[PDB]
Amino acid sequence: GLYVGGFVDVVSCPLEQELYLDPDQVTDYLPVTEPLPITIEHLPETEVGWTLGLFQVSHGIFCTGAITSPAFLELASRLADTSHVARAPVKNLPKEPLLEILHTWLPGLSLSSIHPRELSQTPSGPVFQHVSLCALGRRRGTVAVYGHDAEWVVSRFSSVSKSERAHILQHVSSCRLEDLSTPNFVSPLE
Ligand SMILES: O=C(O)c1ccc(NC(=O)c2cccc(CC3CCCCC3)n2)c(Nc2ccccc2)c1
Known about the structure:
- The chain is built from six helices and eight strands.
- By secondary structure, it is an alpha+beta fold.
- A six-stranded mixed β-barrel has the order 1-5-4-3-7-6.
- The chain is globular, with a radius of gyration of 16 Å.
- Exists in a monomer-dimer equilibrium with the dimer being the active species.
């Protein structure tokens, strides 16, 4: 059970190729402490985990999540330890290969929102749908950090204050990971 943390691009996932929202268009609807699915590249069949919180902080919208899919963790761990392809774009001989592989191959966190037309009015249903781990499409700076404890993960971001991290982590620790439903990811290898 891994944690992920980082700053999100907020996107609408539209006939358009892409719409990147300014964070101030959605901050009225934060924080979100109920679990949203975490998927790969906005694919609904690639659920790998669950969000733990979405928070407005000074330097953007920060996401903390849990990567919990057994099939995904088993596959990513095996590739990290045995695949020269997965290791090719990472530094030689990392101490924590799984964490480095995810940091390199899935560096972008994106938060799916409804369209701004509804955000300015009064939305009827949920404003956010999922967070995705992304290999393309990154607009803002910083990248995702993966690690085995949420404190370490969030403390890697210098732009998150001591008090911001404490607010973020206040909720993260209150979440019990094993009682999260199993995400739907299946290994491509079958
Ligand atoms: O079914 C197929 O034909 C197929 C082909 C390509 C795939 N993935 C890619 O092309 C691809 C590109 C960037 C990032 C990733 C995810 C990342 C997960 C952990 C280890 C390294 C890769 N996948 C995937 N998806 C996938 C691959 C590995 C792990 C998880 C999903 C499926």
